[PDB]
Amino acid sequence: GSHMLPKELQLYFDKILSMIKSDMKDIAIECLEKESGLQQLVPYFIQHISELILKSFKEAEVLKTCIALYFSLIKNKHVFIDPYLHQILPSLLTCVIGKSIVDDDVRKMSADIVKYIYDTYSRSYKTLAPRVLKTLKGVWMDPNRSEDSQYGALYCLSILSKNVVNTVIREHAEEYKRTIGKKKVTNLLDNVLNV
């Protein structure tokens, strides 16, 4: 727990978190991409940020800051992110598919980070791509899921690769249209399949 960190590291950790909901959010995003010596804080930042996303479904600007903080830690040349991708990915996927999110820009922004992880790490870590594809195809094809959830799931699938569009999307398009057919989803589907 963060209460067990050396004093100076807990104070820095608390300072960054306090900047998320403030006019200094952009400085916090820069700090997490550029600062050295943050490795010990990494699991705690991910744990707090994941918890904050669950509490912030109706705060689009807070969700965007959370997604940007994850990307900063992923890009930080002074951090080793690989052991934490298993915790970041489901939190980003909650922003893509979450039922309580009202902003499409949040879903797309998070989907862009999922794509970066997919492109960067799927060939290194075998379980990564199957887990991501299973979650997304599951949400898109679920008749109980909302229009916005299915849209986020399809948008994310659509940007991963041409092979995902051709395997996953092309294979299930007719079943989606026949059995669910939510207009916002079918509109996206028609645009994806024309390319």
Assigned token pair, 111: 């989907």
Q: Are 97 and 149 in contact (CB under 8 A)?
A: yes
**Which two three-digit tokens encode residue 68?**
């940007």
Q: Rounded to the nearest 5°, which phi and psi values hold at 101?
A: -75, 130
Instruction: Name which of 30, 24, 17, 28 is nearest 56 in CA terms.
Output: 17
Instruction: Answer whether 32's CB lies under 8 Å from 48's CB.
Output: no
Structure tokens that stand for 116 in this block: 């970066």
d(CA 40, CA 45) in angstroms, rounded, equals: 10
**Residue 21 is encoded by which pair of tokens?**
């909901």
Token code pair at residue 181: 């057919």
Q: How far is 60 from 65, CA to CA, in rounded Å?
A: 9
Cβ(129)–Cβ(150) below 8 Å: no
Q: How far apart are CA 186 and CA 168, in angstroms?
A: 15
DSSP secondary-structure letter at 145? Answer: S
For residue 98, give the 3-state DSSP assignment: coil
d(CA 129, CA 117): 9
Q: Residues near 35 by Cβ (< 8 Å), separated by ≥ 6?
A: 76, 78
Cα–Cα distance for residue pair 158/168, rounded to 1 Å: 9
What kind of architecture, by CATH, is found in domain 1-195?
Alpha Horseshoe (1.25)
Resolution (Å) of this entry? 1.9
Closest to 150 in 3D by CA, of 96, 105, 101: 96
